[PDB]
Design a protein around this ligand. Structure first.
Ligand SMILES: [Mg+2]
Ligand code: NA
Ligand code: NA
Length: 327
DNA sequence: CGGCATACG
DNA sequence: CGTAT
DNA sequence: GCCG
C-alpha cells in the first residue's frame, strides 16, 4: 500500500504524525553529524513515510509492512506511543555534541566537517568563533555576522518583496528574462530560512552570462550584503523592514529554457524527494536524472522535457504538484 | 553484502 | 572544503 | 538503518 520511494506517494506539507516524524528526524540529523549517511537516509525515509500516512499512528501494529521501519525506527515510535518520549531522542537533544554541531552547522559557510573539527578543538559557542576570526573564511565571517537575522524565519510577504526587486534587476540585465519562485515556498511553506529563485529566458542561449549582470545590478542597488561565469549565486540580501531591514539568504539560479523543467523540478525539492526521485530513476528505470536533464545511458540520449509533467511521465510516475513533494 | 543523488562555487 | 534541492 |  505504501510505496518504497518518496517520489511514488504524495507527501503534504502538514500531516498527521508530526511528533513521530520530528523525533526520527532528530536521529537522522544526529547521524549526519557523525558522518553516518546511510543511517541518516533511513531515518529521513522512515520519517517521510509517516508524513505520507492518511491518519495518526496510534498503535505499533500500524507500522507492519511500512517500508523503512525496522527494529530501530519501530522502537522509537513504540516508546513515543507508550510514554510520549523516546529516551534515545532525548539523550541526543541534550547532548553537548548534538547542540554544538547543530549550532555550528547552521552557520552559512560551516559544514559538518568544519563543525566537527571545531568541536574537537574545544570550541562550543559563536563567541568562541568570533574570538579567532583569522581562522574563518570570508563566507564564514559573513554567516557569523548575519547569523542572528538568518535564524529568523522569512515570511511569504518578505518573498513577494524580494521577487519584485529580483525581477527589476533581471529585467534590466536581460529583457524578457523570467523569475520563478522555487524551493520550499513553491511547495507551499508559509515561512522559510531562505528564498530560492530560478531565472531563464524563452530564447535558448540568451541566458548565457546572465547571472553576473544580475548580481552587478543588485549590488549597485545596495541590496547585496554578501555574495561569492557562474549559474548559482548564494547571496545575503538586505530586506527592508519597518524603520530598518534584515539580512535574508537568497539563492539565484539560471538555466537555459531547454533545461528549465529539470531545474525547476530539482530546485523545488524537497531535498529528500529529489534524492528519492534520482534513486528511483537510476535504479528502477535505468535513467540518470539531475537538475540539467534526464539521460538514457543505453541510447546515449537526453529526454526533452517541456514541463515537470513530461518528466514524471518519462519516469512512469504519477504527477505530483509541488505541494505534495514535501517528503 | 552493496548501495545510499547529484550537482555547482 | 563550502553551497543547493 | 534498512532494502533488495
Ligand atoms: Mg530553500
Ligand atoms: Na552551514
Ligand atoms: Na536556498
Amino acid at each position: 500500500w505504501m510505496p518504497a520511494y518518496a517520489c511514488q506517494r504524495p507527501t503534504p506539507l502538514t500531516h498527521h504524525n508530526t511528533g513521530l516524524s520530528e523525533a526520527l528526524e532528530i536521529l537522522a540529523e544526529a547521524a549526519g553529524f557523525e558522518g553516518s549517511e546511510g543511517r541518516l537516509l533511513t531515518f529521513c525515509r522512515a520519517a517521510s513515510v509517516l508524513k505520507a500516512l492518511p491518519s495518526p499512528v496510534t498503535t505499533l501494529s500500524q507500522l507492519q509492512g511500512l517500508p523503512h521501519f525496522g527494529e530501530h525506527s519501530s522502537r522509537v515510535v513504540q516508546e513515543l506511543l507508550e510514554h510520549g518520549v523516546c529516551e534515545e531522542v532525548e539523550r541526543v537533544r541534550r547532548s553537548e555534541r548534538y547542540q554544538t554541531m547543530k549550532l555550528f552547522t547552521q552557520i552559512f559557510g560551516v559544514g559538518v566537517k568544519t563543525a566537527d573539527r571545531w568541536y574537537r578543538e574545544g570550541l562550543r559557542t559563536l563567541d568562541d568563533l568570533r574570538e579567532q576570526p583569522q581562522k574563518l573564511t570570508q563566507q564564514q565571517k559573513a554567516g557569523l555576522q548575519h547569523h542572528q537575522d538568518l535564524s529568523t524565519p522569512v515570511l511569504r510577504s518578505d518573498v513577494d518583496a524580494l521577487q519584485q526587486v529580483v525581477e527589476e534587476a533581471v529585467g534590466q540585465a536581460l529583457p524578457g528574462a523570467t523569475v520563478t519562485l522555487t524551493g520550499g515556498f513553491r511547495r507551499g511553506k508559509l515561512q522559510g530560512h531562505d528564498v530560492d529563485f530560478l531565472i531563464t529566458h524563452p530564447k535558448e542561449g540568451q541566458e548565457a552570462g546572465l547571472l553576473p549582470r544580475v548580481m552587478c545590478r543588485l549590488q549597485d542597488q545596495g541590496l547585496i550584503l554578501y555574495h561569492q561565469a557562474f549559474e548559482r549565486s548564494f547571496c545575503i540580501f538586505r530586506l527592508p523592514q519597518p524603520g530598518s531591514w534584515k539580512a535574508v539568504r537568497v539563492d539565484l539560479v539560471v538555466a537555459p529554457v531547454s533545461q528549465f523543467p529539470f531545474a525547476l523540478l530539482g530546485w523545488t525539492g524537497s531535498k529528500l524527494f529529489q534524492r528519492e526521485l534520482r534513486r528511483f530513476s537510476r535504479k528502477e528505470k535505468g535513467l540518470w536524472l539531475n537538475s540539467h536533464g534526464l539521460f538514457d545511458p543505453e541510447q546515449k540520449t537526453f529526454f526533452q522535457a517541456a514541463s515537470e509533467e513530461d518528466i514524471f511521465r518519462h519516469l512512469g510516475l504519477e504527477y505530483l504538484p509541488p505541494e505534495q513533494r514535501n517528503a
